Design a protein around this ligand. Structure first.
Ligand SMILES: Nc1ncnc2c1ncn2[C@@H]1O[C@H](COP(=O)(O)OP(=O)(O)OP(O)(O)=S)[C@@H](O)[C@H]1O
Ligand SMILES: [Mg+2]
Lengths: 65, 272, 287
């Protein structure tokens, strides 16, 4: 009766989006506004905004009614 | 998210014939209710009046202070279109309905503004009467939307596509130049019924590539290579067909004319 | 209408709740009667957020009209179980509650929504033992480039107490940690009488962080220097708790909001995969 983690499977009908931690390496963050130290203090990073923008850009792009 | 939202499940329609049929059914139902005569309006006159009042809502949101975020305006316009899909302008005057849509959009999009400022944006007794009418019609507007209030706009997908182009499309030197024309084409799309037929991401990509075409830059490689559509040519053909249909839909859009609109306003005021 | 009013359930500052039955499917549900502004903004927020979400561990908005909000009927809440003395909370029960809460929160954060009102009485339980998050009247969508007076004070994260305007999932995660503490001690973890008092108790229990543990602490507008405490080490706080549970608690209580573990990372820890597994919901304790 042991638990085993399985990732959530949500079909997005669009291109694959790179992982949140991989955004800095791939170079996306060079085109988003940097987070102020006040923002970083509360836990907001520019990677969150970039990831959200990419997810909305790629969502439902390959879906038809 | 859009891919499992209520907008995709209930408010994206297969074709324009579906929208025309829904509007015709609404007009016919209103006529049947009223009967139980040239006073009534034809569906195309209703469409012209709806375009005119959507334009009026756009300018109202543009003049509004404090400044309205673009998401609020887009949500209000989507509310207007959705409400007049299944309702006749003769049963409910669009002049009140557009203000109710702006009110509900401000509430939904967390643009915290008190009612006195809202009515003060209107050009005092008339302001109070308008506020009372908005209070009367708010719940009706909510019911006609089937309690589906989150509206997915193409502005954030546009920004995401801009980021992706800046990152993994070096052959396009500066994606920032594809902003003014892309935004203008996005507005022109918003004027049509494309918001009820296509996904926000599709609309954003269509605007981006239309701006690219106007600048002479082809980006078929962005779809084929950067977007990994070489694996599936059928998906690429489907996307190109959707974009071509959107461009044609924008091409055939007919702006309302002043004389026809004035006659329609006279007729509608007679109906009220 | 479609529902017959069977019983009166409870009261609230924004609404009144009634246990009712719909005759079309003859099912028991809960109707929430909402009591120059217009429609209540909290009810509008709940409507706009619960229609876009569908998950087994999130309360379902079955129907709404004019305004009453129809939800699934839930027997109890986690606070009732915690405050009860007859029921004993074995580690398997705590594991099951934490697993359901973290699955619901993982789904919620995947769709870029912060609950912002997590506490034991907001975690509703059904007859079959399924735990669902509820009270979405303070929830909000994040990730876009927010008032600092959110979350109940006993469950508020230190960054919120220091008046953080922009934040992330950490404000939820910290609350989960407090809930976990409440599940182990059967008592509120940090019962402060004020924001300053809450911060004082936080720093007494866990120690005063430094710039090493929180690089930009001093940039928060409501940050004031506090006394230095060593903080009680977590293993004396929770005497009956295995090392994996201590690891999870330490992850949930890191002072750095960025370093604090997310729902996904929390679900991947060894604590949830180790023996014994979570108790099946069909045999969870019932008050
Ligand atoms: N879906 C539900 N099914 C059964 N009972 C519910 C349900 N939702 C809420 N309740 C119960 O009905 C009452 C709801 O009251 P609430 O307003 O949600 O809580 P509250 O803390 O009193 O409100 P505040 O102080 O404004 S946050 C409580 O007794 C809840 O346990
Ligand atoms: Mg509550």
């Amino acid at each position: 009766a042991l638990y085993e983690y399985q990732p959530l499977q949500i079909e997005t009908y669009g291109p694959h989006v790179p992982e949140l931690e991989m955004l800095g390496r791939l170079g996306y963050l060079n085109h988003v506004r940097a987070a102020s130290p006040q923002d970083l203090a509360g836990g907001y990073t520019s990677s969150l905004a970039c990831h959200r923008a990419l997810q909305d850009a790629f969502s439902g792009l390959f879906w038809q009614p | 998210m859009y891919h499992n939202s209520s907008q995709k499940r209930h408010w994206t329609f297969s074709s324009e014939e579906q929208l025309a049929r829904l509007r015709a059914d609404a007009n016919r139902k209103f006529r049947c209710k009223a009967v139980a005569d040239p006073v009534f309006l034809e569906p195309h006159e209703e469409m012209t009046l709806c375009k005119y009042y959507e334009k009026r809502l756009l300018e109202f949101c543009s003049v509004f202070k404090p400044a309205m975020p673009r998401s609020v305006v887009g949500t209000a316009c989507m509310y207007f279109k959705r409400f007049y899909l299944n309702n006749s302008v003769m049963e409910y005057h669009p002049r009140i309905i557009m203000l109710t849509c702006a009110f509900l959009a401000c509430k939904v999009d967390e643009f915290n503004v008190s009612s006195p400022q809202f009515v003060g944006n209107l050009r005092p007794l008339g302001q109070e009467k308008a506020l009372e009418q908005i209070l009367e019609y708010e719940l009706l507007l909510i019911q006609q939307l089937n309690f589906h209030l989150i509206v997915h706009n193409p502005y954030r997908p546009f920004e995401g596509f801009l980021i992706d182009l800046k990152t993994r499309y070096p052959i396009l030197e500066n994606p920032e130049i594809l902003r003014k024309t892309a935004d203008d084409f996005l507005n022109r799309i918003a004027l049509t019924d494309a918001y009820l037929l296509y996904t926000p991401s599709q609309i954003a990509l269509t605007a981006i590539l239309s701006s690219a075409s106007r600048a002479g830059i082809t980006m078929e490689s962005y779809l084929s290579e950067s977007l990994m559509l070489k694996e599936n040519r059928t998906c690429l053909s489907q996307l190109l067909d959707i974009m071509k249909s959107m461009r044609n839909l924008v091409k055939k859009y007919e702006p309302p004319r002043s004389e026809e609109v004035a006659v329609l306003k006279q007729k509608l005021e007679r109906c009220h | 209408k479609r529902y017959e009013k069977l019983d009166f359930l409870g009261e609230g500052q924004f609404a009144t709740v009634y246990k009712a039955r719909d005759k079309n499917t003859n099912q028991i549900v809960a109707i929430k009667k909402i009591k120059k502004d217009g429609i209540n903004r909290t009810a509008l927020r709940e409507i706009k957020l619960l229609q876009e979400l569908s998950h087994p561990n999130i309360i379902g908005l079955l129907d709404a009209f004019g305004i009453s909000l129809v939800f699934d009927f839930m027997e109890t809440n986690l606070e009732v179980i915690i405050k009860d003395n007859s029921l004993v909370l074995t580690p398997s029960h705590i594991k099951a509650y934490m697993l359901m809460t973290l699955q619901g929160l993982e789904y919620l954060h995947q769709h870029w929504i912060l609950h912002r009102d997590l506490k034991p009485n907001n975690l509703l339980l059904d007859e079959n033992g399924v735990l669902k998050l509820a009270d979405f009247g303070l929830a909000k969508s994040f990730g876009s480039p927010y008032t600092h007076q959110v979350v109940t004070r006993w469950y508020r994260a230190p960054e919120l107490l220091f008046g953080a305007r922009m934040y992330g999932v950490g404000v939820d995660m910290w609350a989960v940690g407090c809930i976990l503490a409440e599940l182990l001690l059967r008592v509120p973890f940090l019962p402060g009488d004020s924001d300053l008092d809450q911060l004082t108790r936080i720093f007494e229990t866990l120690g005063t962080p430094t710039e090493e543990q929180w690089p930009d602490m001093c940039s928060l507008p409501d940050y004031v220097t506090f006394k230095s405490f060593p903080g009680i080490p977590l293993h004396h706080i929770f005497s009956a708790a295995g090392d994996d549970l201590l690891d999870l608690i330490q992850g949930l209580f890191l002072f750095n909001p960025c370093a604090r573990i997310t729902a996904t990372q929390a679900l991947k820890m060894k604590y949830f995969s180790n023996r014994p597994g979570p108790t099946p919901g069909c045999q969870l304790p019932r008050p």
